[PDB]
């Protein structure tokens, strides 16, 4: 048994009368004829409440804390990527639509992206034979990342699809600290460690990656470039 709280947009939500034993108070919420539920550690009907549509969606209700603002959340089933949020506050809502925009070229490697806005932002991911690089559209760039221990490394794409990759290494101790310099013209990565060239990252034509290592003097490519297969691999030469 509950008590109903007035929301903003004409929105009701149920808090109970009293907390569990841990202190804190169940929440249930109907919402288009969905109806969530959650806990919070207020009494007054703020707090987050979840819930699931028919079509495999992940619904996220958050009341501020002052019950002057609703924020309502559909995700797609991994219950991360964001779909729609609508903000009411101050007898006003907000419902925005993330655009969307796949592209897949001739040996069906993709790049998908989700959460378009008008600001130029989004999410972003390269779909690759083999594994799935993530990352965000910002100014209408695409930028992927892979991280590892402190090294980050970088994939951009411009918006006319220009492809160019950095490394940052945060790392204090020059022992171990990443370094690496992008040459345009082979559309290659080579690393350096302690004044040691180690490896040579080629993105290929063919939307690959291999790796191939350099010799003790840091000097000369030795063995073969390795074609990448999974995004293990990919950190393994970042470490």
Do not use: H
Not at 70 to 75: A, I, M, Q, W
Not at 115 to 137: F, N, R
Not at 144 to 171: H, Q, Y
Request: hydrophobic share 30%; net charge neutral.
């Amino acid at each position: 048994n509950s008590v109903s709280v007035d929301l903003p947009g004409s929105m009701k939500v149920l808090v109970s009368k009293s907390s569990n034993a841990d202190g804190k108070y169940d929440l249930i919420a109907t919402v288009d004829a969905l109806e969530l539920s959650g806990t919070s550690d207020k009494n007054n009907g703020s707090g987050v409440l979840e819930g699931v549509k028919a079509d495999a969606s992940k619904v996220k209700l958050t009341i501020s804390d002052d019950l002057g603002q609703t924020t309502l959340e559909v995700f797609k089933s991994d219950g991360s990527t964001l779909v729609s949020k609508k903000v009411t506050s101050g007898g006003s809502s907000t419902e925005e639509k993330g655009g969307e925009k796949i592209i897949t070229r001739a040996d069906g490697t993709r790049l998908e992206y989700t959460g378009i806005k008008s600001d130029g932002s989004g999410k972003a991911k390269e779909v690759l034979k083999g594994y799935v690089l993530e990352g965000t559209l910002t100014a209408e760039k695409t930028t992927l990342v892979v991280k590892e221990g402190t090294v980050t490394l970088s994939k951009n794409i411009s918006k006319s699809g220009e492809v160019s990759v950095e490394l940052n290494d945060t790392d204090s101790s020059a022992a171990t600290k990443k370094t690496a310099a992008w040459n345009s013209g082979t559309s290659t990565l080579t690393i350096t460690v302690n004044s040691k060239k180690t490896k040579d990252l080629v993105f290929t034509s063919s939307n690959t990656i291999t790796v191939q290592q350099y010799d003790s003097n840091g000097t000369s490519l030795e063995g073969s470039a390795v074609e990448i297969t999974k995004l293990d691999e990919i950190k393994n030469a970042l470490k």
